[PDB]
């Protein structure tokens, strides 16, 4: 089997991408944030504290003939950005882009943090990291991808995020028309439960490439590119007037600037992030200070190849027995 679904930016900055997901019978379609940095499929639901729902589409398990309470199971997750959610668990039929999993753990939110409430466009998350991170207790549950894997034509999914435009998540096949040149594959460590890999270096604009190992995770659920302070300092030093602002919470730059590109290494290959991808616009409405798309990972504890980086590539998440990551230009 295969599946193919379009993923759509939630706003004009590409702060996140939502992908429609069919849950239950008859289908209830929710727009979920596919997150290769976590491993819980959770949704706003009929059980979510009413004051914490503000415009989201909810899953109502009582209206699904295939929903079954997973008795005794609870979940609770905290994300890197400080947001969180928790609740109980149903199993139900879940389909993405024509690909159907029966018996998928659908984690029903009883509580969500303010960040989620305030984002009316995201109805929940669909985790695509390794199932070892799944938070369901006392019986850990598998991700959608893990459940689908054996049925897939090939044990892969691909992320093809657009810049200020829709893109595609595919399951079970590699669309050879969706990228240019060749796909370069690189080793993955699953030791932390992430799609963790090592970039071979970077360049700033038309500058020379610096060969240096940068360990990080391919994380579709993170907006920006978070890299070591050295790397990030080198990037923003090429933008006149750019500075790190503790009050704002990262590097800002004059909105009048033309940003340089940023290149990262994948083996001997190179992925170029155009400067425009690194512009996240005014820090506040009407401000001439703009927020940068490359930020320091210092204090996160891990480097994160988030959407800023991933949307510059066609990315293969290879879930074979020995997982790997593939990157191509497009």
According to the 3-state scheme, what is the secondary structure of the chain?
Answer: CCEEEEEEECCCCCCCEEEEEEECCCCEEEEEEEECCCCCEEECECCCCHHHCCCCCCECHHHCCCCEEEEEEEEEEECCCCCEEEEEEEEEEEEECCEEEEEEEEEEEEEECHHHHCCCCCCEEEECCCHHHCCCECCCCCCHHHHHHHHCCCCEEEEECCCCCCEEEEECCCCCCCCCCCCEEEECECCCCCCEEEEEEEEECCCCCEEEEEEEEECCCCCCEEECHHHHHHHHCCCCCCEEECCCCEEEEECCCCCCCEEEEECCEEEEECHHHHEEEECCCCCCEEEECEEECCCCCCEEECHHHHCCCEEEEECCCCCEEEEECC
To one decimal place, what's the resolution in Å? 1.5
CB 224 within 8 A of CB 306: yes
Q: Which of 64, 86, 108, 199 is catalytic?
A: 199
Name the experimental technique. X-ray
CA dist 221 and 176 (Å) reads: 24
Measured distance CA(68)–CA(246) in Å, rounded:
48
Other CB atoms within a 10 A radius of the CB of residue 276 amount to 12
Task: Please state, in angstroms and as integers, the Cα–Cα distance from residue 48 to each residue in 28, 60, 62, following that order.
Answer: 16, 10, 14
35 included as an active-site residue: yes
Marked catalytic residue, from 35, 88, 219, 307: 35
Answer yes or no: are the C-beta atoms of 36 and 160 closer than 8 Å: no
Q: Which residues contact 318 (CB under 8 A, 6 or more apart)?
A: 155, 156, 185, 188, 324, 325, 326
* Longest Cα separation, the chain: 60
In CATH, the number for domain 175-330 is 2.40.70.10
Every domain of the chain with CATH number 2.40.70.10 lies at: 5-174, 175-330
CATH code linked to domain 5-174: 2.40.70.10
CA distance 119 to 32: 12
Catalytic, 199? Answer yes
């Amino acid at each position: 089997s295969t599946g193919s679904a379009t993923t759509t930016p939630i706003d004009s900055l590409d702060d996140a991408y939502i992908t429609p997901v069919q849950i239950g019978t008859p289908a209830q379609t929710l727009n979920l944030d596919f997150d290769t940095g976590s491993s819980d499929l959770w949704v706003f639901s009929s059980e979510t504290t009413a004051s914490e729902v503000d415009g989201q589409t909810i899953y109502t398990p009582s209206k699904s003939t295939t929903a079954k309470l997973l008795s005794g199971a609870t979940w609770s997750i905290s994300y890197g950005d400080g947001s969180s959610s928790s609740g109980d668990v149903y199993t139900d039929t879940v389909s993405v882009g024509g690909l159907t999993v029966t018996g998928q753990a659908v984690e029903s939110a009883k509580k969500v943090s303010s960040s989620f409430t305030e984002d009316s466009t995201i109805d929940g998350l669909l985790g695509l990291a390794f199932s070892t991170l799944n938070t369901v207790s006392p019986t850990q549950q598998k991700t959608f991808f893990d459940n689908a894997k054996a049925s897939l034509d090939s044990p892969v999914f691909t992320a093809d995020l657009g810049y200020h435009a829709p893109g595609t998540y595919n399951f079970g096949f590699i669309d050879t028309t969706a990228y240019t040149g060749s796909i370069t594959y690189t080793a993955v460590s699953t030791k932390q439960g992430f799609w963790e890999w090592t970039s071979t270096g970077y360049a700033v604009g038309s500058g020379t490439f610096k060969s240096t190992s940068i360990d990080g995770i391919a994380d579709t659920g993170t907006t920006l590119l978070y890299l070591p302070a050295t790397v990030v300092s080198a990037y923003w030093a090429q933008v006149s007037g750019a500075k790190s602002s503790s009050s704002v919470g990262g590097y800002v730059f004059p909105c009048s600037a033309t940003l340089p590109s940023f290149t990262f290494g994948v083996g001997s290959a190179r992925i170029v992030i155009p400067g425009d991808y690194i512009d996240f616009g005014p820090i506040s409405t009407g401000s001439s200070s703009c927020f940068g798309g490359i930020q320091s990972s210092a204090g996160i504890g891990i480097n994160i190849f988030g959407d800023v980086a991933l949307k510059a590539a066609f990315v293969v998440f290879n879930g074979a027995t020995t997982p790997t990551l593939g990157f191509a230009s497009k």
